[PDB]
Symmetry: C3
Subunit: 136 residues, 3 copies
Protein backbone atom coordinates (compact mmCIF):
# COMPACT_ATOMS: atom_id res chain seq x y z
CA UNK A 1 0.00 0.00 0.00
CA UNK A 2 1.58 3.43 -0.87
CA UNK A 3 0.85 6.64 0.98
CA UNK A 4 2.60 9.90 0.22
CA UNK A 5 4.77 11.29 3.10
CA UNK A 6 6.31 14.83 2.99
CA UNK A 7 10.03 15.02 3.75
CA UNK A 8 12.27 18.05 4.23
CA UNK A 9 16.08 17.71 4.15
CA UNK A 10 17.88 19.36 6.99
CA UNK A 11 21.48 18.72 6.06
CA UNK A 12 23.23 19.39 2.61
CA UNK A 13 25.01 16.11 2.83
CA UNK A 14 21.73 14.12 2.54
CA UNK A 15 21.07 13.04 -1.08
CA UNK A 16 24.69 14.17 -1.89
CA UNK A 17 27.18 12.48 0.37
CA UNK A 18 24.77 9.62 0.97
CA UNK A 19 21.33 8.85 -0.36
CA UNK A 20 17.84 9.36 0.71
CA UNK A 21 16.31 6.20 2.15
CA UNK A 22 14.71 3.80 -0.21
CA UNK A 23 12.98 0.42 0.02
CA UNK A 24 15.50 -2.23 -1.12
CA UNK A 25 12.89 -4.48 -2.60
CA UNK A 26 9.26 -4.07 -3.55
CA UNK A 27 8.35 -6.34 -0.67
CA UNK A 28 10.38 -4.41 1.92
CA UNK A 29 8.54 -3.19 4.96
CA UNK A 30 11.31 -0.91 6.48
CA UNK A 31 13.54 1.88 5.16
CA UNK A 32 17.16 1.96 6.43
CA UNK A 33 18.21 5.27 8.08
CA UNK A 34 21.85 6.47 7.99
CA UNK A 35 23.87 8.29 10.55
CA UNK A 36 24.24 11.94 9.40
CA UNK A 37 27.40 12.57 11.30
CA UNK A 38 30.49 14.70 10.71
CA UNK A 39 32.89 12.32 12.33
CA UNK A 40 32.73 8.76 13.39
CA UNK A 41 31.39 8.11 16.91
CA UNK A 42 33.08 5.36 18.96
CA UNK A 43 30.65 3.63 21.42
CA UNK A 44 32.19 1.73 24.37
CA UNK A 45 29.96 -1.01 25.83
CA UNK A 46 27.20 0.71 27.78
CA UNK A 47 27.29 4.02 25.94
CA UNK A 48 24.42 5.59 24.18
CA UNK A 49 24.54 8.53 21.70
CA UNK A 50 22.08 10.51 19.64
CA UNK A 51 22.59 10.43 15.96
CA UNK A 52 20.91 12.87 13.56
CA UNK A 53 19.54 11.63 10.30
CA UNK A 54 19.49 15.06 8.63
CA UNK A 55 15.78 14.41 7.76
CA UNK A 56 12.40 15.52 9.07
CA UNK A 57 9.11 13.98 7.87
CA UNK A 58 5.53 14.98 8.44
CA UNK A 59 3.19 11.95 8.27
CA UNK A 60 0.27 14.24 8.79
CA UNK A 61 -2.37 11.52 8.55
CA UNK A 62 -3.55 10.65 12.13
CA UNK A 63 -4.30 6.99 11.24
CA UNK A 64 -0.51 6.39 10.60
CA UNK A 65 2.63 6.38 12.72
CA UNK A 66 6.23 5.28 12.02
CA UNK A 67 8.35 2.98 14.31
CA UNK A 68 12.15 2.94 14.44
CA UNK A 69 13.59 -0.56 15.08
CA UNK A 70 17.16 -1.93 15.38
CA UNK A 71 18.74 -3.60 12.32
CA UNK A 72 19.03 -7.34 12.94
CA UNK A 73 22.62 -7.95 12.02
CA UNK A 74 23.91 -5.03 13.91
CA UNK A 75 21.62 -5.73 16.91
CA UNK A 76 22.18 -9.42 17.11
CA UNK A 77 25.78 -9.59 15.79
CA UNK A 78 27.20 -6.38 17.18
CA UNK A 79 25.00 -5.34 20.15
CA UNK A 80 24.05 -2.02 18.47
CA UNK A 81 20.43 -1.21 19.15
CA UNK A 82 18.28 1.75 20.09
CA UNK A 83 18.54 3.34 23.61
CA UNK A 84 14.74 3.66 23.76
CA UNK A 85 14.33 0.15 22.18
CA UNK A 86 11.59 1.19 19.71
CA UNK A 87 11.07 4.83 18.70
CA UNK A 88 7.53 5.96 17.82
CA UNK A 89 7.09 8.92 15.48
CA UNK A 90 3.60 10.66 15.62
CA UNK A 91 1.73 12.01 12.69
CA UNK A 92 2.15 15.56 13.84
CA UNK A 93 5.86 15.40 14.74
CA UNK A 94 7.89 17.59 12.29
CA UNK A 95 11.29 17.99 13.96
CA UNK A 96 14.49 16.07 12.98
CA UNK A 97 14.46 12.23 13.16
CA UNK A 98 17.08 11.43 15.82
CA UNK A 99 18.15 7.90 16.60
CA UNK A 100 19.12 6.87 20.13
CA UNK A 101 21.89 4.30 19.53
CA UNK A 102 22.87 2.17 22.61
CA UNK A 103 25.88 -0.31 22.74
CA UNK A 104 24.29 -3.22 24.63
CA UNK A 105 27.18 -5.51 23.84
CA UNK A 106 30.64 -6.13 25.08
CA UNK A 107 32.94 -4.53 22.40
CA UNK A 108 33.49 -0.89 21.48
CA UNK A 109 31.95 -0.07 18.09
CA UNK A 110 32.49 3.00 15.89
CA UNK A 111 29.63 4.38 13.92
CA UNK A 112 30.76 5.64 10.50
CA UNK A 113 29.28 8.74 8.81
CA UNK A 114 26.52 7.54 6.55
CA UNK A 115 26.36 4.02 8.02
CA UNK A 116 22.83 2.44 8.09
CA UNK A 117 22.02 2.01 11.76
CA UNK A 118 18.28 1.63 12.24
CA UNK A 119 15.18 1.03 10.17
CA UNK A 120 11.75 2.62 9.97
CA UNK A 121 8.30 1.12 9.06
CA UNK A 122 4.92 2.97 8.77
CA UNK A 123 2.01 1.26 10.59
CA UNK A 124 -1.69 2.14 10.87
CA UNK A 125 -2.61 3.21 14.45
CA UNK A 126 -6.03 3.49 15.98
CA UNK A 127 -6.97 6.16 18.57
CA UNK A 128 -8.96 4.72 21.41
CA UNK A 129 -12.06 6.34 22.71
CA UNK A 130 -12.37 4.92 26.28
CA UNK A 131 -15.79 3.60 27.40
CA UNK A 132 -15.82 3.50 31.27
CA UNK A 133 -17.50 0.45 32.66
CA UNK A 134 -17.44 -0.71 36.21
CA UNK A 135 -17.12 -4.38 35.08
CA UNK A 136 -16.69 -6.27 31.77
Amino acid sequence: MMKKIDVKILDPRVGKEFPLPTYATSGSAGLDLRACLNDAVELAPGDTTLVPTGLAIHIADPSLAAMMLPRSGLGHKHGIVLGNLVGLIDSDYQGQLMISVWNRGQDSFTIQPGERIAQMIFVPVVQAEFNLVEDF
Copy 2:
Protein backbone atom coordinates in the same frame (compact mmCIF):
# COMPACT_ATOMS: atom_id res chain seq x y z
CA MET B 1 -9.41 6.38 13.21
CA MET B 2 -11.41 6.03 16.51
CA LYS B 3 -12.53 2.74 17.98
CA LYS B 4 -14.27 2.47 21.33
CA ILE B 5 -12.31 0.52 24.02
CA ASP B 6 -13.90 -0.48 27.40
CA VAL B 7 -11.89 0.43 30.50
CA LYS B 8 -12.46 -0.47 34.14
CA ILE B 9 -10.63 1.38 36.93
CA LEU B 10 -9.02 -0.83 39.50
CA ASP B 11 -7.63 1.72 41.91
CA PRO B 12 -9.50 4.76 43.54
CA ARG B 13 -6.53 6.95 42.95
CA VAL B 14 -6.93 6.76 39.13
CA GLY B 15 -8.90 9.77 37.77
CA LYS B 16 -8.52 11.37 41.29
CA GLU B 17 -4.90 11.53 42.32
CA PHE B 18 -3.80 11.45 38.70
CA PRO B 19 -5.71 11.38 35.45
CA LEU B 20 -6.88 8.83 33.05
CA PRO B 21 -4.66 8.63 29.98
CA THR B 22 -5.40 10.93 27.14
CA TYR B 23 -3.92 11.67 23.72
CA ALA B 24 -1.89 14.90 24.04
CA THR B 25 -2.60 16.03 20.52
CA SER B 26 -5.08 15.01 17.87
CA GLY B 27 -2.20 13.54 15.90
CA SER B 28 -0.84 11.49 18.81
CA ALA B 29 -0.44 7.79 18.24
CA GLY B 30 0.35 6.70 21.90
CA LEU B 31 -1.26 7.28 25.30
CA ASP B 32 1.12 7.81 28.27
CA LEU B 33 0.59 5.38 31.21
CA ARG B 34 1.40 6.40 34.81
CA ALA B 35 2.82 4.42 37.63
CA CYS B 36 -0.04 3.67 40.10
CA LEU B 37 2.20 3.26 43.08
CA ASN B 38 1.86 3.98 46.79
CA ASP B 39 5.45 4.92 47.31
CA ALA B 40 8.27 5.80 45.06
CA VAL B 41 10.36 2.87 43.77
CA GLU B 42 14.15 3.37 43.53
CA LEU B 43 15.73 1.31 40.66
CA ALA B 44 19.51 0.65 40.86
CA PRO B 45 21.17 -0.06 37.49
CA GLY B 46 20.14 -3.57 36.45
CA ASP B 47 16.93 -3.74 38.46
CA THR B 48 13.55 -4.39 37.07
CA THR B 49 10.17 -3.89 38.85
CA LEU B 50 6.52 -4.35 38.01
CA VAL B 51 4.42 -1.28 38.19
CA PRO B 52 0.60 -1.36 38.24
CA THR B 53 -1.33 1.14 36.25
CA GLY B 54 -4.57 0.71 38.23
CA LEU B 55 -6.37 0.12 34.85
CA ALA B 56 -7.70 -2.86 32.92
CA ILE B 57 -8.98 -2.59 29.33
CA HIS B 58 -10.81 -5.03 27.14
CA ILE B 59 -10.08 -4.41 23.42
CA ALA B 60 -12.45 -7.17 22.55
CA ASP B 61 -12.09 -6.78 18.78
CA PRO B 62 -9.75 -9.58 17.50
CA SER B 63 -8.39 -7.43 14.62
CA LEU B 64 -6.74 -5.04 17.22
CA ALA B 65 -3.98 -5.32 19.79
CA ALA B 66 -2.16 -2.72 21.93
CA MET B 67 1.69 -2.43 22.31
CA MET B 68 3.48 -0.89 25.29
CA LEU B 69 6.70 0.95 24.32
CA PRO B 70 9.32 2.90 26.32
CA ARG B 71 9.08 6.72 26.40
CA SER B 72 11.94 8.20 24.37
CA GLY B 73 13.31 10.73 26.80
CA LEU B 74 13.28 8.41 29.68
CA GLY B 75 14.65 5.50 27.59
CA HIS B 76 17.32 7.39 25.79
CA LYS B 77 18.16 10.01 28.47
CA HIS B 78 17.70 7.98 31.62
CA GLY B 79 17.99 4.27 30.65
CA ILE B 80 14.42 3.52 31.85
CA VAL B 81 12.76 1.07 29.52
CA LEU B 82 10.58 -2.01 29.68
CA GLY B 83 11.99 -5.36 31.02
CA ASN B 84 10.20 -7.24 28.22
CA LEU B 85 11.17 -4.50 25.68
CA VAL B 86 7.73 -4.29 24.03
CA GLY B 87 4.57 -5.52 25.79
CA LEU B 88 1.74 -6.91 23.65
CA ILE B 89 -1.80 -6.76 25.00
CA ASP B 90 -4.34 -9.21 23.31
CA SER B 91 -7.90 -8.43 22.53
CA ASP B 92 -9.17 -10.87 25.08
CA TYR B 93 -6.85 -9.90 27.95
CA GLN B 94 -8.90 -8.25 30.78
CA GLY B 95 -6.57 -8.26 33.79
CA GLN B 96 -4.60 -5.22 35.10
CA LEU B 97 -2.11 -3.49 32.74
CA MET B 98 1.26 -4.01 34.44
CA ILE B 99 4.45 -2.42 33.17
CA SER B 100 7.79 -4.19 33.47
CA VAL B 101 10.23 -1.30 34.06
CA TRP B 102 13.98 -2.18 33.68
CA ASN B 103 16.93 0.21 34.55
CA ARG B 104 19.26 -0.48 31.60
CA GLY B 105 21.45 2.48 32.45
CA GLN B 106 24.17 3.30 34.86
CA ASP B 107 22.45 5.54 37.53
CA SER B 108 19.85 4.68 40.14
CA PHE B 109 16.46 6.21 39.27
CA THR B 110 13.37 6.61 41.46
CA ILE B 111 9.97 6.23 39.96
CA GLN B 112 7.47 8.69 41.46
CA PRO B 113 3.80 7.83 42.10
CA GLY B 114 1.87 8.97 39.08
CA GLU B 115 4.94 9.50 36.87
CA ARG B 116 4.40 8.72 33.13
CA ILE B 117 6.69 5.79 32.40
CA ALA B 118 5.58 4.03 29.23
CA GLN B 119 3.24 4.58 26.32
CA MET B 120 0.60 2.49 24.57
CA ILE B 121 -0.57 2.45 20.88
CA PHE B 122 -3.41 0.33 19.33
CA VAL B 123 -2.45 -1.45 16.07
CA PRO B 124 -4.45 -3.66 13.70
CA VAL B 125 -3.21 -7.30 13.79
CA VAL B 126 -3.90 -10.06 11.34
CA GLN B 127 -4.30 -13.74 12.35
CA ALA B 128 -2.46 -16.04 10.04
CA GLU B 129 -4.00 -19.15 8.64
CA PHE B 130 -0.94 -21.30 7.70
CA ASN B 131 -0.91 -22.95 4.24
CA LEU B 132 1.64 -25.86 4.34
CA VAL B 133 3.69 -26.15 1.22
CA GLU B 134 6.74 -28.25 0.72
CA ASP B 135 8.43 -25.46 -1.32
CA PHE B 136 7.66 -21.84 -2.29
Copy 3:
Protein backbone atom coordinates in the same frame (compact mmCIF):
# COMPACT_ATOMS: atom_id res chain seq x y z
CA MET C 1 -8.99 -10.80 10.31
CA MET C 2 -7.52 -14.00 8.67
CA LYS C 3 -5.02 -13.98 5.85
CA LYS C 4 -3.46 -17.14 4.46
CA ILE C 5 0.36 -17.40 4.95
CA ASP C 6 2.46 -20.15 3.24
CA VAL C 7 4.79 -22.10 5.53
CA LYS C 8 7.45 -24.68 4.70
CA ILE C 9 8.92 -26.93 7.42
CA LEU C 10 12.66 -27.13 7.46
CA ASP C 11 13.25 -29.62 10.23
CA PRO C 12 11.59 -33.14 10.69
CA ARG C 13 11.15 -32.51 14.34
CA VAL C 14 8.63 -29.67 13.73
CA GLY C 15 5.01 -30.94 13.95
CA LYS C 16 6.46 -34.25 15.40
CA GLU C 17 8.62 -33.58 18.40
CA PHE C 18 6.82 -30.31 19.05
CA PRO C 19 3.91 -28.61 17.34
CA LEU C 20 3.44 -26.04 14.75
CA PRO C 21 2.55 -22.66 16.24
CA THR C 22 -1.04 -21.93 16.92
CA TYR C 23 -3.05 -19.06 18.38
CA ALA C 24 -3.96 -20.03 21.97
CA THR C 25 -7.25 -18.21 21.93
CA SER C 26 -9.43 -16.74 19.23
CA GLY C 27 -8.52 -13.30 20.50
CA SER C 28 -4.76 -13.93 20.47
CA ALA C 29 -2.65 -11.52 18.49
CA GLY C 30 0.74 -13.42 18.63
CA LEU C 31 1.87 -16.99 17.87
CA ASP C 32 4.52 -18.50 20.21
CA LEU C 33 7.69 -19.76 18.45
CA ARG C 34 9.74 -22.67 19.89
CA ALA C 35 13.42 -23.25 19.93
CA CYS C 36 14.23 -25.97 17.33
CA LEU C 37 17.39 -27.08 18.99
CA ASN C 38 19.20 -30.40 19.34
CA ASP C 39 20.53 -29.74 22.78
CA ALA C 40 19.78 -27.25 25.43
CA VAL C 41 21.69 -23.95 25.23
CA GLU C 42 22.90 -22.40 28.52
CA LEU C 43 23.02 -18.54 28.38
CA ALA C 44 25.24 -16.76 30.96
CA PRO C 45 24.24 -13.14 31.68
CA GLY C 46 25.28 -11.07 28.68
CA ASP C 47 25.28 -13.88 26.13
CA THR C 48 23.28 -13.94 23.00
CA THR C 49 22.63 -16.97 20.72
CA LEU C 50 20.75 -17.66 17.52
CA VAL C 51 18.04 -20.20 17.73
CA PRO C 52 16.44 -21.82 14.67
CA THR C 53 12.73 -22.35 14.58
CA GLY C 54 12.84 -25.02 11.85
CA LEU C 55 10.24 -22.92 9.91
CA ALA C 56 10.26 -20.56 6.94
CA ILE C 57 7.20 -18.50 5.93
CA HIS C 58 6.49 -16.42 2.88
CA ILE C 59 4.03 -13.58 3.67
CA ALA C 60 4.13 -12.57 0.06
CA ASP C 61 1.61 -9.74 0.41
CA PRO C 62 3.55 -6.40 0.48
CA SER C 63 0.95 -4.68 2.74
CA LEU C 64 1.88 -7.13 5.62
CA ALA C 65 4.94 -7.78 7.75
CA ALA C 66 5.51 -9.91 10.88
CA MET C 67 7.27 -8.70 14.13
CA MET C 68 9.04 -10.97 16.62
CA LEU C 69 8.69 -9.76 20.24
CA PRO C 70 9.93 -11.12 23.60
CA ARG C 71 7.50 -13.16 25.75
CA SER C 72 6.53 -11.13 28.82
CA GLY C 73 7.14 -13.63 31.56
CA LEU C 74 10.43 -14.70 30.26
CA GLY C 75 11.49 -11.10 29.46
CA HIS C 76 10.33 -9.51 32.64
CA LYS C 77 10.81 -12.48 35.03
CA HIS C 78 13.90 -14.08 33.57
CA GLY C 79 15.71 -11.41 31.49
CA ILE C 80 15.38 -13.47 28.27
CA VAL C 81 14.66 -11.21 25.35
CA LEU C 82 15.71 -10.74 21.75
CA GLY C 83 19.28 -9.53 20.88
CA ASN C 84 17.85 -7.23 18.18
CA LEU C 85 14.93 -6.23 20.51
CA VAL C 86 12.22 -6.54 17.84
CA GLY C 87 12.73 -8.62 14.67
CA LEU C 88 10.95 -7.51 11.49
CA ILE C 89 10.17 -10.12 8.84
CA ASP C 90 9.47 -8.71 5.27
CA SER C 91 6.91 -10.00 2.89
CA ASP C 92 9.51 -11.29 0.51
CA TYR C 93 11.79 -12.97 3.08
CA GLN C 94 11.68 -16.80 2.60
CA GLY C 95 14.68 -18.10 4.58
CA GLN C 96 14.50 -19.74 8.05
CA LEU C 97 13.00 -17.73 10.97
CA MET C 98 15.92 -17.35 13.40
CA ILE C 99 15.51 -15.80 16.82
CA SER C 100 18.28 -13.75 18.40
CA VAL C 101 17.94 -14.57 22.12
CA TRP C 102 19.91 -12.26 24.52
CA ASN C 103 20.28 -12.84 28.36
CA ARG C 104 19.84 -9.27 29.64
CA GLY C 105 19.52 -10.43 33.21
CA GLN C 106 21.77 -11.51 35.98
CA ASP C 107 21.34 -15.37 36.12
CA SER C 108 22.41 -18.05 33.66
CA PHE C 109 19.40 -19.57 31.88
CA THR C 110 19.21 -22.75 29.79
CA ILE C 111 16.97 -22.86 26.79
CA GLN C 112 15.30 -26.27 26.40
CA PRO C 113 14.63 -27.90 23.01
CA GLY C 114 11.12 -26.97 22.03
CA GLU C 115 10.71 -24.25 24.68
CA ARG C 116 8.54 -21.25 23.60
CA ILE C 117 10.90 -18.29 23.57
CA ALA C 118 9.45 -15.48 21.47
CA GLN C 119 6.20 -14.53 19.82
CA MET C 120 5.20 -13.29 16.38
CA ILE C 121 2.32 -10.97 15.25
CA PHE C 122 1.38 -9.95 11.64
CA VAL C 123 0.80 -6.20 11.16
CA PRO C 124 -0.24 -4.16 8.11
CA VAL C 125 2.63 -1.91 6.87
CA VAL C 126 2.45 1.01 4.52
CA GLN C 127 5.22 1.87 2.00
CA ALA C 128 5.97 5.54 1.94
CA GLU C 129 6.32 7.48 -1.24
CA PHE C 130 8.39 10.55 -0.19
CA ASN C 131 7.20 14.00 -1.34
CA LEU C 132 10.20 16.44 -1.10
CA VAL C 133 9.27 19.82 0.20
CA GLU C 134 11.61 22.53 1.30
CA ASP C 135 9.30 23.44 4.24
CA PHE C 136 6.07 22.07 5.80
